[PDB]
Amino acid sequence: VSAYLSRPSPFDLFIRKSPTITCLVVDLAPVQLTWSRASGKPVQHSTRKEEKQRNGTLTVTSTLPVGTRDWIEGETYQCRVTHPHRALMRSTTKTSGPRAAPEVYAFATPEWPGSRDKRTLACLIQNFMPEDISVQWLHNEVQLPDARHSTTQPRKTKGSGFFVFSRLEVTRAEWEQKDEFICRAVHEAASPSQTVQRAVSVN
Amino acid sequence: VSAYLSRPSPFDLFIRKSPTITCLVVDTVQLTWSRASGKPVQHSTRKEEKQRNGTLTVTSTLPVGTRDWIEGETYQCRVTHLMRSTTKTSGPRAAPEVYAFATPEWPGSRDKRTLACLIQNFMPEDISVQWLHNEVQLPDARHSTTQPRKTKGSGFFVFSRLEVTRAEWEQKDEFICRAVHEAASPSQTVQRAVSVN
Ligand SMILES: *[C@@H]1O[C@H](CO)[C@@H](O[C@@H]2O[C@H](CO)[C@@H](O[C@@H]3O[C@H](CO[C@H]4O[C@H](CO)[C@@H](O)[C@H](O)[C@@H]4O)[C@@H](O)[C@H](O[C@H]4O[C@H](CO)[C@@H](O)[C@H](O)[C@@H]4O)[C@@H]3O)[C@H](O)[C@H]2NC(C)=O)[C@H](O)[C@H]1NC(C)=O
Numbered sequence: 001v002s003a004y005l006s007r008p009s010p011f012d013l014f015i016r017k018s019p020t021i022t023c024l025v026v027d028l029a030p031v032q033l034t035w036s037r038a039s040g041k042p043v044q045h046s047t048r049k050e051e052k053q054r055n056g057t058l059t060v061t062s063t064l065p066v067g068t069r070d071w072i073e074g075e076t077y078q079c080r081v082t083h084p085h086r087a088l089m090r091s092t093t094k095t096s097g098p099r100a101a102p103e104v105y106a107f108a109t110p111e112w113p114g115s116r117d118k119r120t121l122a123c124l125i126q127n128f129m130p131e132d133i134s135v136q137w138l139h140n141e142v143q144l145p146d147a148r149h150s151t152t153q154p155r156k157t158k159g160s161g162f163f164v165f166s167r168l169e170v171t172r173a174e175w176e177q178k179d180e181f182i183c184r185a186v187h188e189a190a191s192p193s194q195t196v197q198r199a200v201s202v203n
Numbered sequence: 204v205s206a207y208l209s210r211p212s213p214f215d216l217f218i219r220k221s222p223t224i225t226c227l228v229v230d231t232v233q234l235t236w237s238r239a240s241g242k243p244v245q246h247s248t249r250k251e252e253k254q255r256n257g258t259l260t261v262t263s264t265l266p267v268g269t270r271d272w273i274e275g276e277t278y279q280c281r282v283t284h285l286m287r288s289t290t291k292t293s294g295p296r297a298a299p300e301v302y303a304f305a306t307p308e309w310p311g312s313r314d315k316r317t318l319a320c321l322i323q324n325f326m327p328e329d330i331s332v333q334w335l336h337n338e339v340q341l342p343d344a345r346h347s348t349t350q351p352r353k354t355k356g357s358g359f360f361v362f363s364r365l366e367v368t369r370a371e372w373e374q375k376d377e378f379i380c381r382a383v384h385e386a387a388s389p390s391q392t393v394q395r396a397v398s399v400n
């Protein structure tokens with residue numbers, strides 16, 4: 001029975017402007033989740049989700065909407081996990097410390113033998129702080145569904161700053177409609193709109 | 204009290220030809236090896252260190268025979284204060300496709316460049332990534348590699364990152380990204396060079 005409490009994605013916080021936090025309870029034995037704010041102020045209604053897993057574990061998640069300004073101005077949120085009558089407290093707040101905007105480099109790999117129809121696009125995003133980042137790919141100025149790319153977890157560079165890589169597979173028809181895809185990073189330290197974007201062309 | 208058992212790195216298995224397997228225990232603890240075939244195991248090395256978060260990490264590294272491992276032996280690590288087992292991966296094989304590239308100079312950092320490597324479409328997941336400069340292997344701490352992730356279709360991919368300084372590429376603009384993998388032919392290595400400028 002462990003619990004995990006996430007921060008809002010940069011995308012939800014700065015672009016969609018409706019941030020949420022999630023409390024995730026992996027219950028090894030088939031539970032109330034209670035939200036509160038350190039400031040003492042009221043919390044919104046939360047959404048409780050539960051599901052038996054493919055290994056027989058019960059998973060419970062509660063998703064709480066939070067105010068944008070509240071979150072950016074340093075509010076702490078608390079998830080309390082209890083049974084009918086000991087408890088587990090998780091809390092989350094924005095990260096402190098120095099800020100640094102991400103640097104974005106997008107690349108297209110050449111044709112590998114035997115797959116004339118598919119190209120791989122890659123994006124290196126590095127030297128940002130703190131490590132919360134959202135990565136999106138755009139094609140023809142429209143944002144692609146999140147499930148079409150995968151992004152690695154942030155790792156520490158040698159000095160300061162984190163880096164992630166993102167991967168996008170494109171078909172021949174996509175780059176032949178227009179040969180410009182965009183890798184966009186959403187991060188709190190990027191100015192002035194909290195986004196940094198770079199284009200790449202297949203041929 | 205978590206326990207993990209790791210297969211040999213392809214580098215140790217196919218290049219060095221001295222593969223090891225590692226039993227990692229996080230949070231005295233007895234760590235005992237056995238072979239499924241019943242044969243004896245070699246002498247292992249127990250490492251113990253306290254971490255910053257007050258937990259104690261115990262690892263045991265066990266040398267294994269190369270032919271034994273490649274022909275399908277199953278090894279077991281049992282923990283005593285709970286067992287884990289490991290064996291060569293089975294299934295379809297596919298060689299890694301390697302692409303190495305250099306980032307353009309980022310405004311401000313004129314003395315540094317980032318080399319990166321994409322390696323994808325390989326099966327199974329075990330892979331070793333190394334960087335060479337002027338045909339000499341760089342120390343492993345110079346680079347970092349992501350964990351193998353499943354592709355949308357068939358295969359896995361990893362990314363590797365190597366920061367280099369101005370003096371390095373000016374004296375030779377030949378860096379090589381080399382993958383060691385069981386399905387790569389020949390000699391289980393595939394590699395691709397990149398130049399900065
Ligand atoms: C039965 O099967 C279920 C389903 O697979 C297992 O549930 C998984 O349990 C593990 C840990 O017990 C969970 O891993 C943890 O996930 C946390 C949340 O990650 C999600 O959300 C973030 C956004 O905040 C995404 O980036 C991420 O990709 C996930 O979507 C992480 O925060 C945790 O990381 C911390 O712990 C790890 C060690 O595990 C450290 O290495 C990290 O540094 C970090 O401190 C952690 O990774 C996993 O999410 C669960 N899967 C679910 C809910 O689908 C059961 O464990 C399994 N039961 C048994 C007995 O095997």
Ligand SMILES: *[C@@H]1O[C@H](CO)[C@@H](O[C@@H]2O[C@H](CO)[C@@H](O[C@@H]3O[C@H](CO[C@H]4O[C@H](CO)[C@@H](O)[C@H](O)[C@@H]4O)[C@@H](O)[C@H](O[C@H]4O[C@H](CO)[C@@H](O)[C@H](O)[C@@H]4O)[C@@H]3O)[C@H](O)[C@H]2NC(C)=O)[C@H](O)[C@H]1NC(C)=O
Pocket residue numbers: 205207209227229254255256258260350
């Ligand atoms: C106090 O601080 C210490 C030091 O950071 C923590 O120790 C870590 O504990 C976690 C426990 O979850 C360990 O995480 C596990 O490590 C396994 C070892 O992997 C080795 O091989 C890989 C190659 O792939 C290396 O990259 C890696 O660094 C190791 O050398 C992983 O195999 C485990 O992976 C599991 O989850 C992933 C996805 O999340 C799956 O793909 C795997 O199949 C597997 O299910 C896992 O990541 C971590 O290695 C420990 N580090 C050290 C240095 O000891 C303590 O946990 C921490 N204490 C507390 C209470 O937080």
